[PDB]
Design an enzyme around this catalytic site. Structure first.
Site, PDB file in Angstrom:
ATOM      1  CG  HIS A  87      68.953 -73.380 -45.658  1.00  0.00           C
ATOM      2  ND1 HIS A  87      70.128 -73.379 -45.007  1.00  0.00           N
ATOM      3  CD2 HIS A  87      67.952 -74.128 -44.930  1.00  0.00           C
ATOM      4  CE1 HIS A  87      70.103 -74.434 -43.794  1.00  0.00           C
ATOM      5  NE2 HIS A  87      68.883 -74.608 -43.589  1.00  0.00           N
TER       6      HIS A  87
ATOM      7  N   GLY B  68      67.405 -77.764 -38.043  1.00  0.00           N
ATOM      8  CA  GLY B  68      66.807 -77.103 -36.988  1.00  0.00           C
ATOM      9  C   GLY B  68      67.782 -76.238 -36.327  1.00  0.00           C
TER      10      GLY B  68
ATOM     11  CB  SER C 153      69.758 -74.236 -40.651  1.00  0.00           C
ATOM     12  OG  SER C 153      70.323 -75.410 -40.981  1.00  0.00           O
TER      13      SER C 153
ATOM     14  CB  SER D 193      75.617 -73.693 -44.070  1.00  0.00           C
ATOM     15  OG  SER D 193      74.871 -73.819 -45.228  1.00  0.00           O
TER      16      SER D 193
ATOM     17  CG  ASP E 101      72.716 -71.215 -46.272  1.00  0.00           C
ATOM     18  OD1 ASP E 101      71.682 -70.551 -46.195  1.00  0.00           O
ATOM     19  OD2 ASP E 101      72.721 -72.253 -45.812  1.00  0.00           O
TER      20      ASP E 101
END
Length: 198
Positions: free
Chosen positions: A36, A141, A143, A159, A63
């Site tokens: 993502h 942030g 992720s 994720s 993801d």
């Protein structure tokens, strides 16, 4: 730039995410991160300099993504912990109840335990299946960032989390947090990547 798990990189001069782990694919250098965070061919920058582009990704469903880096980047077998480093020694998957830590540019390095595996996250874009849940806290942030045991075993990449109005779930008790990561092993075999370790 030196590529260390946990650090900030931007995508097309707009979103921010955190580096997961240094990988090679043959002679190509890259780092794995969350799907993502960018679409294929989005430009990744670290410290204002272009370091590479998103080569492949899968989001939603899974993801996961990896960014192919130019030759000037220095891949390092390390994840950031404040001013110090955790060495990546391998990727043995840890079992539920194992203590695990995560590194990202918003909340830094947080630790907790693995509480469940094979969780579905229902994000706005669609569901993401097969995620592992931990109760280490995290924020927007973070992720893409690394999840790793203190012993150096790389677990996966950040994720999503049940973030509160402050942007993280660090202010609610561990019992109530749900911070999810995508397991690293399927990312490595899907794209034929090897983990840099030391």
């Amino acid at each position: 730039a030196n590529i260390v798990g946990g650090i900030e990189y931007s995508i097309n001069n707009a979103s921010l995410c955190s580096v997961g782990f240094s990988v090679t694919r043959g002679a190509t250098k890259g780092f794995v991160t969350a799907g993502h965070c960018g679409t294929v061919n989005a430009t990744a920058r670290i410290g204002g300099a272009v370091v590479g582009t998103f080569a492949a990704r899968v989001f939603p469903g899974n993801d996961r993504a990896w960014v192919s880096l130019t030759s000037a980047q220095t891949l390092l077998p390390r994840v950031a912990n404040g001013s110090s480093f955790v060495t990546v020694r391998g990727s043995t998957e840890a079992a539920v109840g194992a203590a695990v830590c995560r590194s990202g540019r918003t909340t830094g390095y947080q630790c907790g335990t693995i509480t469940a595996k094979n969780v579905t996250a229902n994000y706005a874009e669609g569901a993401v299946r097969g995620l592992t849940q931990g109760n280490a806290c995290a924020g927007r942030g973070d992720s893409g960032g690394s999840w790793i045991t203190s012993a150096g075993q790389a677990q996966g990449v950040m994720s999503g989390a049940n973030v509160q109005s402050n942007g993280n779930n660090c202010g609610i008790p561990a019992s109530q947090r749900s911070s999810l990561f995508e397991r690293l092993q399927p990312i490595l075999s899907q794209y034929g990547l090897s983990l840099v370790t030391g």
